[PDB]
Write a protein of this length. Structure first.
Ligand SMILES: O=c1ccn([C@@H]2O[C@H](COP(=O)(O)OP(=O)(O)O[C@H]3O[C@H](CO)[C@@H](O)[C@H](O)[C@H]3O)[C@@H](O)[C@H]2O)c(=O)[nH]1
Ligand SMILES: O=c1ccn([C@@H]2O[C@H](COP(=O)(O)OP(=O)(O)O[C@H]3O[C@H](CO)[C@@H](O)[C@H](O)[C@H]3O)[C@@H](O)[C@H]2O)c(=O)[nH]1
Ligand SMILES: [Mn+2]
Ligand SMILES: [Mn+2]
Lengths: 302, 302
């Protein structure tokens, strides 16, 4: 199965693979009643976002019913450059105005549930350098085929998550939810899920949103509702070791909470070397949230 | 305090620093009755070990009462090259013959308790490229000064643990034992402890030995028994991402166990890309142990 896989191949819970022999035109006919929304979380991506949107543009009005970019309060020219790419911009404020704004990616995705209409929601990051046009078709594929799959996770390859995936998320999963050891990229920003699922689960804060979702899906619906799809090659912003430490802490906090383990709520305090010889250390404490958002069905029922 | 630190500076639990104004000759007079043993764990280090031993050689017969290299079953010429460096070689077999051998670094250090005699034991890794001669004096310093310190941990700087320290150990500590957030390098192979402490605590398997020790020390004796000392510059073997994943898993397993959290015992399964395009994946499952060794006082009481 994993001895030969092509960009598009689907893996089911029961160690079974499937090669997709359809087109964008074929999947659209397999919809019938069900609608697809694509959401792009964005916090200052004025350089990359244009190219991201253009790859998805031809899908709109056909397969994709609506393309939405969720603005996490960008201070640069992201808001104006997204419109010029032919995308609809919805900020956190207008996505759900009657609930106060909280920082983090988890919020953005949670708020986008209220902002979107589609029966199926697809998330794609807006910092992707050259995304392949077939990304969205590949993610929706396993959902349109009737069997009871609610969450589609993607796996990718670095060109010629990263470290945090391989050292934090995956080993911790092996320790706490061993069944999810078959997930290759648990913290993948590119994934698709049905509204029925998304609106019934709580949404983890910050960078904990993905791993929270994965575990929540597995705990309620079992492994049989989760599928994996090969995308091929992924590339985005190169995060410094300092940032990765913070993200790890949030991934830990989110995963520990989903497993009924009390997390301290104490932020990761880092010690960055000042001078060349490491003569002194600058103390840096990243914030960590243990506050989930309630299932959207509790706030604004579809 | 951390605004200006020199190689040798000691940090106490109560956020207090001390600059060591003594020599190797001065500390030796401050011993009186108490003895020091230095242990070097070694599993195939035939290139580095000679240089490691030579740095510690002049301390023997004076400050260091005995220098012991604990052989973890090296297949190369480590066993013969260690003797030629003027070091005493004790394998796992002869360190404690009446207990069957288990693989991993944790075993090596546990067995070395039975093999060593000193009231104070100092551990230094044998894969260190150019260790500073003052390493051992710096580690024993806070122990010889009477106040109730039982474990001395070192911090270092990369030249011009690594990732696992910063992404796994430290954030997880912040989550589970928040007080140990002030520890800079929790997985440091260079450290010193009193026999009274070492023989009363269980010894974690594999690369979990250090973090297990740190937590066990903190849980029983509190933060007041743990001190930190600057060493300056450290360098060793550059471990590939695959290995680091395994180590992380063991660090997690060990830390989770010390916190009364049940670990699955399921090994981390990794997916390494085969070809250039990542056309297929090779499945690789590292072993993980949840088996501590009992306190040495239970096996061979000093
Ligand atoms: O407060 C925020 C922070 C980020 N983002 C957006 O989310 C996407 C991914 O953010 P990024 O910081 O680049 O994620 P990474 O640091 O690379 O972390 C990786 O792993 C995370 C943990 O699951 C995922 O959330 C990410 O998609 C994935 O890229 C980007 O388009 C951002 O604009 C927001 O909308 N709001
Ligand atoms: O089964 C083993 C494995 C290793 N070692 C020795 O232990 C030392 C450190 O091993 P290494 O694999 O180089 O450690 P790292 O992968 O670099 O891990 C870092 O972080 C670990 C987690 O605490 C510490 O054990 C290490 O000292 C520290 O170098 C070396 O002298 C080895 O010869 C053994 O004696 N037996
Ligand atoms: Mn990114
Ligand atoms: Mn090493």
């Amino acid at each position: 199965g994993l001895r030969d896989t092509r960009p598009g191949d689907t893996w089911l819970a029961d160690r079974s693979w499937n090669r997709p022999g359809w087109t964008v035109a074929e999947l659209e006919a397999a919809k019938a009643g069900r609608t697809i929304s694509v959401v792009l979380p964005a916090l200052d991506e004025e350089d990359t976002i244009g190219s991201v949107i253009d790859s998805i543009s031809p899908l709109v009005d056909g397969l994709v019913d609506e393309l939405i970019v969720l603005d996490s309060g960008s201070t640069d020219d992201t808001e104006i450059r997204a419109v010029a790419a032919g995308a609809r911009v919805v900020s956190r404020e207008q996505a759900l105005p009657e609930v106060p704004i909280r920082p983090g990616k988890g919020e953005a995705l949670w708020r986008s549930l209220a902002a979107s209409r589609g029966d199926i929601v697809v998330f794609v990051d807006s910092d992707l350098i050259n995304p392949h046009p077939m990304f969205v078709p590949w993610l929706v594929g396993p959902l349109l085929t009737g069997d009871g799959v609610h969450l589609v996770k993607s796996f990718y390859r670095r060109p010629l998550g990263g470290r945090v995936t391989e050292l934090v998320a995956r080993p911790l999963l092996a320790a706490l939810r061993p069944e999810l050891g078959c997930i290759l990229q648990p913290l993948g920003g590119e994934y698709a899920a049905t509204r029925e699922l998304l609106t019934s689960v709580p949404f983890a804060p910050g960078y904990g949103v993905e791993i929270g979702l994965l575990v929540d899906t597995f705990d309620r619906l079992g492994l049989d509702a989760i599928a994996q799809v090969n995308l091929g090659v992924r590339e985005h912003r190169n995060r410094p070791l300092a940032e990765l430490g913070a993200m790890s802490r949030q991934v830990i906090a989110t995963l520990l909470s989903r497993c009924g383990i009390p997390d301290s709520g104490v932020g990761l305090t880092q010690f960055v070397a000042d001078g060349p010889e490491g003569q002194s250390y600058t103390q840096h404490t990243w914030p960590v949230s243990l506050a989930d958002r309630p299932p959207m069905q509790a706030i604004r029922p579809r």
